[PDB]
Structure formats: C-alpha cells, structure tokens
Amino acid sequence: MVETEPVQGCRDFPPEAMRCRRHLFDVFHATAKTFGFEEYDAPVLESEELYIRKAGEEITEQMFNFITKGGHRVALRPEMTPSLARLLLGKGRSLLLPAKWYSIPQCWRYERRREHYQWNMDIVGVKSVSAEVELVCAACWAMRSLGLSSKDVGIKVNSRKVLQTVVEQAGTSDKFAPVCVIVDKMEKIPREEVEAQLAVLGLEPTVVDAITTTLSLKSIDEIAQRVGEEHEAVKELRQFFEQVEAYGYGDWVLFDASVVRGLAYYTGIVFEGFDREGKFRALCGGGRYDNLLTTYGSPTPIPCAGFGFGDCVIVELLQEKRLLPDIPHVVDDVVIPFDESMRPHALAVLRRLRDAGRSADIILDKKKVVQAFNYADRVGAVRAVLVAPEEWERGEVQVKMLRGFAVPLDRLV
Amino acid sequence: MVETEPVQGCRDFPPEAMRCRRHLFDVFHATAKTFGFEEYDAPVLESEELYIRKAGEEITEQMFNFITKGGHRVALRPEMTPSLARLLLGKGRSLLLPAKWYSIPQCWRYERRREHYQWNMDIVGVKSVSAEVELVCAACWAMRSLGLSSKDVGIKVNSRKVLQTVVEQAGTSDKFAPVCVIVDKMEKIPREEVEAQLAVLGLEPTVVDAITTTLSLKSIDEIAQRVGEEHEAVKELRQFFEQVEAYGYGDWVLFDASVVRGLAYYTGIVFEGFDREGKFRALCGGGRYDNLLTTYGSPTPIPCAGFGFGDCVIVELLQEKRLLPDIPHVVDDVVIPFDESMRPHALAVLRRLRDAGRSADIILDKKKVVQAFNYADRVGAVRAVLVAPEEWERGEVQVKMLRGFAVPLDRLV
Ligand SMILES: N[C@@H](Cc1c[nH]c[nH+]1)C(=O)O
Ligand SMILES: N[C@@H](Cc1c[nH]c[nH+]1)C(=O)O
Ligand SMILES: Nc1ccc(Cl)cc1N
Ligand SMILES: Nc1ccc(Cl)cc1N
C-alpha cells in the first residue's frame, strides 16, 4: 500500500475541506473587488537571494529552500511581498500609479504547519496614510463579511517612526531593523530574553530602557508628550484614526505602542488583527514599507503599504464563534433515466438543463429509481428530473422538488 | 539591483496577464459546476515514490524533484492524478460513490516552460462509458464557453483494449504499459525510432507489425473486422459515440486508432483535444484508469476516468482565433474628494457605495479634480462621484457617467 497521508506539515483539501477554504477565499476575492484591488500572481518558486535581508527575521530563518540540479539557490516563498516588489521593479515607469494589487498565495516554511495560504493586499505609490486606512478597512470588511464584528475582533495600530526616533537619538540606523525584529518578540518571550538580544546587538542599557518605556505607552497623547505633537508620526496616526472613523470602522481600531511586527522592511504605520478574548495569535498583519523598492535597486523611492491575512487563525476563530457551519454540496437537478433505454433522452434533457445555466448531474451507472433518488438527496440536489417512457411520448418528464409532477420539456427551465 | 525576471521556466502574472488567466479559470470552474463536479486540492509538494511507475513515461523522466534536509525524497507534482488517488485511497469506504472531483493545480517539470496550470476533471466509481462521455462533454463545453466551436476543434477517441488484445495474443501484460508509452511517440518520431524502442523492449517484428496496422485503422467498423463486433471495446465505443451524439456534441468527437496517450495507467477509453487546422499540440487529454487504485494497494478495484486540460495550448489557440481580447480592469465608482477637507465625507460616501455591493475606489493621494477624473478613466470606472462642499450641504454629490448631475446621497445606490 502507498502512503495516504500528505507530505509533512501539508494539508489535503478533499471536497468538504475545500468548501470551507472556498468560503474564505470568496470573501478575500469579494473584498478585494469591493475595494478596487487587482489580482496578480507569481511563481511559488523564487530565487533564495530575494529573501536574504540579514536582520534575524523568523521568515528568513525558516526558509523552505533547496538547490536545483543546475546549482541555483531557490526557495518556496515564505511570503509574497518580495515577489510583488520584484514584479513592481520590473515594470518600472510603465507601471501606472497608484496600484492596488492583491493575491492569495500559498507560502512555505521549514522548521507544525509548513504551508499556509495568505491573502495579500498592497497599495503602491501612495505616500499618505490613506493607504493604510484603506488597507485596515479592507481587513475589517473581510472579517465582518465572514460574520465577525467589532465585539469579536479589532485591529491594533502603531508607527515605527516613534521607535525610529529613540534609536536615532541614542546613536545608527543600520541597527534599527534588527531591533524592531527583537522588540517584536517582547510579547512572546521574557523581557530578560529580549534585553539580552538587544545587548548582544551592542545597544546600551540606556536605549533599552527608552525602548521599553515607549513600547508600554498606552495612548497617542502620551506619545505626543515624549516625541512632540507634530512628530510626523503623531499627525499621521491622528489622520489615520480620523479617516477610519469617518469610513465607519472606529469601533474596530485602536492604538497600541507595542505593535512593531517581525518584518525588517516596515518604516511607518504597522498593524495587527486580534481577537478580543485573548485566545489566538494575530489574525493578520501589515504596514508601510517605503524603502524596500529602493533597497531592491529602484532609482526613485516607491512608497508601499500592505498586509497578509493567513488562513489558519481566522478559521479557528470562526470555528470558536460557530461561524463555520459546514455547507454541504448542492446541485440544481439530478436527471434520472427510468432505465438504460431512456439514457439518450435523459442526456438530451441534461443538455437542456445545463444550457439554461443550471447545475445538473445525470445518474451515470446502472441503478434503480429509488437508489437514484437517494443518490440525488445525498448530493444535495434541489430537484430530481425523472425521464420515463410514458411521459417522454407526451413531450414531458417527471419533476420532483427535493427541498412528482409531469412537466413539458420547454417548461423545465 | 535585484533580478526582476522570475525563476527559469516560470511565469509572472501581473494584473493584465492575471485577467487572461482568470477568464480561463472562470470557465473551468463554471463548467465543473455545470457538470456537478466538486473542487478539491492537495499539496503541490508530494513524495517522490508516488510517481515511480517504471514505464519510461516523460512525466516521470522529467520530475522536478529534490531532497529535504530531513532526507525525504519529494517532488513538485508533475500531474494531479496520483494526488487524487492518494486522497481517494485514504478515504476508503467513507468515500461515497460515484464521486466527481475537479481541481486546477499548478504542475511542474524539469528538463522551455517548467510549470503550467492544468484543469483536472475525474469521475470515480463509474464502471461504464457514461463517465468518459460526461468527461469528454465537459471538455467541449469548456472550449465552446471560451468561444470555440466544432469547426475549430474536436476530440479524438480510442480504446487501449484494442491494443491490449494484440499484445496479449502475441505473448505478457507486464509489457503493455511500456508499449503504450512507446507507441504514443509514433506521431512525433519516425517509425524507425519507435520500432527500435519496441524491439529494445524485446518484442518481435510480428507483434510490431500488428501494432502498426491497428494504430492506422480508420473506422470503428475496421476495428470490428480485426477484433470482433462484440469485443467489449467495440460495444463501449459505440455506446460512447451514441451517448455523446445524444447530448448534442456528435460534431465534436471522432474515432482515431492512433490515440493511446503517454501515461501508463490508462486501461480503456483514451482521448485528446485537437485544433482542426493541425497547428497545435493536444489541447487536453484523458482516459479510463481502472487499475491505478488497485496498484496503490486498494483491496477492492476502483474504476476511474479523467482528463487534464492545460493552460498553454488553449490560450495560443484562442489568440490565433482572436478570442482573447484583453479585457481592461473595471470598477463601478471612483469617489473624488474636491479637496482634503472633503476627505472624511468622501470616505463616508465610499462606505455607502461599497455597502450596496458596488466596487469603488477613492482617490487616495492629494490631486486635482481633473487629474482624478483621468485617473478614474484609466482604471475603467463606470462612474465618478465628486464630493464637493456646496453639494454636501444640500445632502448631495456630483455624479458623472463615464461610459455632472447633483444626486441625493440615498439615490447614489
Ligand atoms: N509579507 C507580510 C505581510 C505584508 C504584505 N505587504 C506588506 N506586508 C507578512 O507575511 O507578514
Ligand atoms: N494526469 C493526466 C490527465 C488525467 C487526469 N485524470 C486522468 N488523466 C495528464 O497529465 O495528462
Ligand atoms: N511565513 C510563514 C510561512 C508558512 C507558514 Cl505555515 C507560516 C508562516 N508564518
Ligand atoms: N507534465 C507537465 C508538467 C509541467 C509542464 Cl509545464 C508540462 C508538462 N507536460
């Protein structure tokens, strides 16, 4: 016998599971269309150097990578943003801006799940916080579309520019991205573990204190005290909250100075979806990354912002809230030939039903009417169309609503 | 600068290209729904042993495979059918039959394109030729849905049981699959090249002659002469053509004794889509594979049939026929704030438009009304909604159909 289980850390999607996945993706697609985003895709296989950012990120540490027979360093993508940037950089100035691009790539890791799907939404060429507003609104929209409300979830919001200043004032920008990465672990691991990693980086106790203090500031007015009420970060966050309020999602968003995210390239606003019961990891996460494309070699800086919204946590949350009823398969009609002699006519009928835009099966193998009705019920047919000899000569079939009257063929549809 | 081109043999899908892909996939999805097929998926990464069939197949020869760090032999799938079978075998008798499963997996190869998408349709648990009929009808349906007609394309049809007999009568079944694989190359390479490979296998000139002769038989009546009018293969092919005729696609299908296909596991009917101008490779291909699941270790034999329908040839054909007009992006509304002071109201309006199921952008960065209208035109907006101070106090906005009247907010939608 052959191994029936999938490769380590990977999921099979038989029909029942695939319907659940579809329910989720329909929402991501529908939301992207509602917000004017355009679909794109790129190869799951990318060059390894595309991710070599040298900042101690988990996403680069846990790369599912290998070498081709031709000796090329490749990887199954751990995230999409680098593919996006590559695509953007290749377009250059033929690319018209602003651009709003989205996708639902499978992404991979190696260390426990080794793949996940991640809805990516990104706005490109928009300097202002209106991009982040739109992005954050898209994510709430998606969650509400799935049945969640502001009671169930929210979106925490911060700016890395705050911490940028404190790192600048205590020194060298080259170390900022590495620090954000370490400081991201603060919620997870003890302060002792994070302090030591920051000290290992070569930062002194003075700057570490200031970092700690600023992560634990509770309101935007407190950030104004420490940084100034016209630090670009303050005006931006106020603009952001004002705009989200005006769109009607003020109950969904809030400030949190502890939110930095684990990715090196964020420069401005960052955000995280969360459940309001404290039970699950981040539902999504994102932010502004204005320098990435400059780092990839762009002559002109390209402002960007976006998020990723995984397919795991959201599903667990929806299951907990009882918002993932299994929805069984459906089909409009099941055509039932009275017997094999009636098959040709049954096919003709099947053609008519399908030509009208209906979803229709025909009983394929040899079986009794009563077996076929049960079969019809099992596949979730709305209607069973029995094709029998007597009715056929009257130009009719027998129709029976499952959720048996004689009907003229033209009336079936 | 970073490498902007994708990894060797792989395609990028920027928005313009992705729309073309979507047009094609919408059809595969829509067709699968019309025919009552159910979506499934499995990991692109599968165990290498899953494909070790030892019959000299191109699909196994050209495997994009590698070794994990844990020392496991894996591969990026060259086809889906083995994943399907694995999924089916794991379900066992909890699986209800017949089952009609479909997917659109990316599949890979290493040798020139190294990936392609392939619509897979498969019927499971159906002994009779009604499965093949349905499958063949689905493929024609798809092609017509894309704008092709019976003038443009057809589906060639044959049975391997014919050749099965001739191999049996001249000898040992273990060699049958290898022979089908060699005989598949007949159309491509010289008869001398195919003869030598069959002779290399250990088959004598007598059986080779008989093979050649039977591949070049032109009608079903000629196969009846050589094999008998009640060879199961004759009755099946007549049943098949009778049923396809009755469904209304008789002009789309025909017999061809040279069609064997390149895959080892086919046992009964096999078929190939083709363009009637002789310009392109196979558009799709499929057949019955009644022993595969027995070979994977099933206690009870499971009848199966299916096809794969690639995304390359079909597109070239549609391009040649001028049936792939580029269809530009569309969005219902573009909300234009008169200026930044109007942004909050513009957002509120944006919310209303989207709540009504409309697709809507808002101008995100700072720009002049006339720039924003041009922007609206460039994104293919059906309508531009200008939000200006004077109209706002009258409870109105300015609306202008792009494919400027004042309108009350409640009337916008
Ligand atoms: N790539 C990020 C999400 C993102 C998309 N765009 C910007 N950020 C992640 O995996 O967390
Ligand atoms: N796997 C086959 C197509 C197929 C699906 N089901 C049966 N056959 C191919 O790649 O050609
Ligand atoms: N980056 C990433 C890739 C794959 C999985 Cl399953 C999880 C993460 N976090
Ligand atoms: N099996 C296969 C896989 C990938 C490509 Cl691009 C082509 C083929 N034929």
Side-chain angles (χ1 to χ4, degrees), chain A residues 1-111 113-162 164-174 176-184 186 189-190 195-196 199 202 205-206 208-225 228 231-234 236-325 327-413, chain B residues 1-111 113-162 164-174 176-184 186 189-190 195-196 199 202 205-206 208-225 228 231-234 236-325 327-413:
Chain A
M1 181 165 293
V2 80
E3 178 57 76
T4 63
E5 300 281 16
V7 166
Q8 183 61 22
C10 304
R11 299 166 293 168
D12 289 325
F13 294 84
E16 53 275 28
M18 193 63 194
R19 291 190 300 258
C20 168
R21 178 167 143 191
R22 268 304 152 199
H23 169 88
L24 180 55
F25 286 21
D26 290 347
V27 168
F28 298 150
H29 286 299
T31 300
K33 183 175 188 190
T34 296
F35 281 64
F37 282 67
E38 288 177 276
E39 198 170 24
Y40 71 99
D41 188 25
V44 68
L45 215 62
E46 291 274 32
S47 172
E48 182 187 73
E49 59 74 27
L50 194 54
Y51 311 96
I52 302 286
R53 294 195 287 266
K54 309 177 188 176
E57 295 163 292
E58 280 202 330
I59 207 156
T60 65
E61 279 173 343
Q62 299 167 9
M63 257 201 308
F64 204 129
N65 60 344
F66 60 97
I67 317 175
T68 71
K69 294 157 186 152
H72 293 269
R73 304 275 294 188
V74 299
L76 299 168
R77 69 193 163 205
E79 46 154 349
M80 200 57 148
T81 315
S83 294
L84 173 56
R86 183 177 58 75
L87 261 50
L88 292 160
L89 188 74
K91 286 249 177 280
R93 31 193 281 186
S94 68
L95 167 74
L96 300 174
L97 299 179
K100 311 207 289 161
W101 285 23
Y102 89 99
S103 195
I104 316 171
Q106 184 171 48
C107 299
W108 297 72
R109 70 182 182 185
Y110 186 91
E111 284 151 307
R113 274 174 53 166
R114 285 174 186 174
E115 56 73 29
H116 72 149
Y117 286 85
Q118 185 187 65
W119 180 35
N120 279 254
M121 296 268 282
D122 286 274
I123 300 178
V124 176
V126 178
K127 293 168 156 49
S128 69
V129 294
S130 53
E132 288 94 323
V133 170
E134 179 96 312
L135 287 158
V136 166
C137 283
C140 300
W141 191 273
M143 291 185 289
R144 208 198 272 203
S145 303
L146 290 157
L148 296 164
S149 80
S150 60
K151 272 184 55 162
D152 301 315
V153 300
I155 305 276
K156 291 161 168 167
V157 188
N158 191 32
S159 183
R160 280 189 173 188
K161 287 159 161 190
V162 170
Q164 183 185 341
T165 303
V166 179
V167 170
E168 276 183 277
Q169 289 177 349
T172 173
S173 70
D174 73 325
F176 178 56
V179 162
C180 290
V181 170
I182 293 174
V183 166
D184 181 66
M186 184 64 160
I189 78 187
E195 284 156 29
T206 325
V208 169
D209 164 83
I211 288 159
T212 313
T213 310
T214 60
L215 294 166
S216 72
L217 298 170
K218 309 301 177 189
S219 68
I220 306 171
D221 296 17
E222 291 178 84
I223 280 71
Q225 289 175 22
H231 202 252
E232 58 187 5
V234 172
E236 287 173 10
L237 290 166
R238 292 220 180 286
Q239 286 168 25
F240 169 90
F241 285 106
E242 185 175 297
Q243 282 178 48
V244 171
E245 276 177 10
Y247 186 80
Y249 278 148
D251 296 324
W252 293 67
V253 304
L254 53 95
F255 177 66
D256 195 322
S258 74
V259 171
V260 300
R261 306 296 297 144
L263 293 156
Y265 45 70
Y266 296 127
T267 53
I269 286 168
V270 293
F271 54 88
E272 284 182 18
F274 69 105
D275 69 305
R276 299 202 186 243
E277 295 174 10
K279 295 183 152 196
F280 299 108
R281 292 130 38 195
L283 294 161
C284 59
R288 175 164 290 280
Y289 53 107
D290 285 352
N291 297 325
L292 183 57
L293 271 74
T294 292
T295 300
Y296 283 30
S298 187
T300 172
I302 295 168
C304 297
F307 69 73
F309 190 128
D311 67 334
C312 186
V313 181
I314 188 63
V315 160
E316 292 181 331
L317 179 61
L318 295 168
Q319 288 172 354
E320 194 243 337
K321 301 280 183 176
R322 315 224 280 101
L323 292 174
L324 267 198
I327 298 303
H329 181 71
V330 295
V331 68
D332 292 326
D333 307 309
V334 168
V335 183
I336 300 173
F338 178 75
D339 57 341
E340 290 305 285
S341 82
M342 301 301 296
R343 189 168 290 282
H345 306 322
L347 285 164
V349 167
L350 183 71
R351 175 62 183 275
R352 282 169 169 266
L353 293 171
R354 292 173 172 164
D355 284 353
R358 300 180 68 75
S359 64
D361 294 323
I362 188 171
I363 303 299
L364 291 170
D365 234 14
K366 194 182 174 189
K367 72 165 54 166
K368 311 303 183 170
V369 175
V370 55
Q371 302 178 254
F373 264 93
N374 185 60
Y375 180 75
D377 181 77
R378 188 231 286 170
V379 297
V382 173
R383 199 169 65 159
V385 180
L386 178 60
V387 186
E390 276 67 23
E391 289 78 13
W392 187 254
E393 284 309 293
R394 304 162 168 181
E396 295 173 338
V397 285
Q398 282 208 49
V399 170
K400 181 161 151 56
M401 304 301 298
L402 311 183
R403 270 79 190 178
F405 295 89
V407 191
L409 267 70
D410 281 28
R411 299 275 78 91
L412 272 181
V413 292
Chain B
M1 181 165 293
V2 80
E3 178 57 76
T4 63
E5 300 281 16
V7 166
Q8 183 61 22
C10 304
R11 299 166 293 168
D12 289 325
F13 294 84
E16 53 275 28
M18 193 63 194
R19 291 190 300 258
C20 168
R21 178 167 143 191
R22 268 304 152 199
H23 169 88
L24 180 55
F25 286 21
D26 290 347
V27 168
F28 298 150
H29 286 299
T31 300
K33 183 175 188 190
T34 296
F35 281 64
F37 282 67
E38 288 177 276
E39 198 170 24
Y40 71 99
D41 188 25
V44 68
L45 215 62
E46 291 274 32
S47 172
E48 182 187 73
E49 59 74 27
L50 194 54
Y51 311 96
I52 302 286
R53 294 195 287 266
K54 309 177 188 176
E57 295 163 292
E58 280 202 330
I59 207 156
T60 65
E61 279 173 343
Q62 299 167 9
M63 257 201 308
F64 204 129
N65 60 344
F66 60 97
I67 317 175
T68 71
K69 294 157 186 152
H72 293 269
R73 304 275 294 188
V74 299
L76 299 168
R77 69 193 163 205
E79 46 154 349
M80 200 57 148
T81 315
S83 294
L84 173 56
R86 183 177 58 75
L87 261 50
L88 292 160
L89 188 74
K91 286 249 177 280
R93 31 193 281 186
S94 68
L95 167 74
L96 300 174
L97 299 179
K100 311 207 289 161
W101 285 23
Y102 89 99
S103 195
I104 316 171
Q106 184 171 48
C107 299
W108 297 72
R109 70 182 182 185
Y110 186 91
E111 284 151 307
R113 274 174 53 166
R114 285 174 186 174
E115 56 73 29
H116 72 149
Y117 286 85
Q118 185 187 65
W119 180 35
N120 279 254
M121 296 268 282
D122 286 274
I123 300 178
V124 176
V126 178
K127 293 168 156 49
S128 69
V129 294
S130 53
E132 288 94 323
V133 170
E134 179 96 312
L135 287 158
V136 166
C137 283
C140 300
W141 191 273
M143 291 185 289
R144 208 198 272 203
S145 303
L146 290 157
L148 296 164
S149 80
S150 60
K151 272 184 55 162
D152 301 315
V153 300
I155 305 276
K156 291 161 168 167
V157 188
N158 191 32
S159 183
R160 280 189 173 188
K161 287 159 161 190
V162 170
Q164 183 185 341
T165 303
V166 179
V167 170
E168 276 183 277
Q169 289 177 349
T172 173
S173 70
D174 73 325
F176 178 56
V179 162
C180 290
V181 170
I182 293 174
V183 166
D184 181 66
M186 184 64 160
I189 78 187
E195 284 156 29
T206 325
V208 169
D209 164 83
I211 288 159
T212 313
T213 310
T214 60
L215 294 166
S216 72
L217 298 170
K218 309 301 177 189
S219 68
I220 306 171
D221 296 17
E222 291 178 84
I223 280 71
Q225 289 175 22
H231 202 252
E232 58 187 5
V234 172
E236 287 173 10
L237 290 166
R238 292 220 180 286
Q239 286 168 25
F240 169 90
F241 285 106
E242 185 175 297
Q243 282 178 48
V244 171
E245 276 177 10
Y247 186 80
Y249 278 148
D251 296 324
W252 293 67
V253 304
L254 53 95
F255 177 66
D256 195 322
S258 74
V259 171
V260 300
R261 306 296 297 144
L263 293 156
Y265 45 70
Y266 296 127
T267 53
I269 286 168
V270 293
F271 54 88
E272 284 182 18
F274 69 105
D275 69 305
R276 299 202 186 243
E277 295 174 10
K279 295 183 152 196
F280 299 108
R281 292 130 38 195
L283 294 161
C284 59
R288 175 164 290 280
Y289 53 107
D290 285 352
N291 297 325
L292 183 57
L293 271 74
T294 292
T295 300
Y296 283 30
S298 187
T300 172
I302 295 168
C304 297
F307 69 73
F309 190 128
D311 67 334
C312 186
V313 181
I314 188 63
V315 160
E316 292 181 331
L317 179 61
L318 295 168
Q319 288 172 354
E320 194 243 337
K321 301 280 183 176
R322 315 224 280 101
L323 292 174
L324 267 198
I327 298 303
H329 181 71
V330 295
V331 68
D332 292 326
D333 307 309
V334 168
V335 183
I336 300 173
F338 178 75
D339 57 341
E340 290 305 285
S341 82
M342 301 301 296
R343 189 168 290 282
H345 306 322
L347 285 164
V349 167
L350 183 71
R351 175 62 183 275
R352 282 169 169 266
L353 293 171
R354 292 173 172 164
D355 284 353
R358 300 180 68 75
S359 64
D361 294 323
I362 188 171
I363 303 299
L364 291 170
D365 234 14
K366 194 182 174 189
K367 72 165 54 166
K368 311 303 183 170
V369 175
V370 55
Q371 302 178 254
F373 264 93
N374 185 60
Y375 180 75
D377 181 77
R378 188 231 286 170
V379 297
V382 173
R383 199 169 65 159
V385 180
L386 178 60
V387 186
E390 276 67 23
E391 289 78 13
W392 187 254
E393 284 309 293
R394 304 162 168 181
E396 295 173 338
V397 285
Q398 282 208 49
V399 170
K400 181 161 151 56
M401 304 301 298
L402 311 183
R403 270 79 190 178
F405 295 89
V407 191
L409 267 70
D410 281 28
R411 299 275 78 91
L412 272 181
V413 292

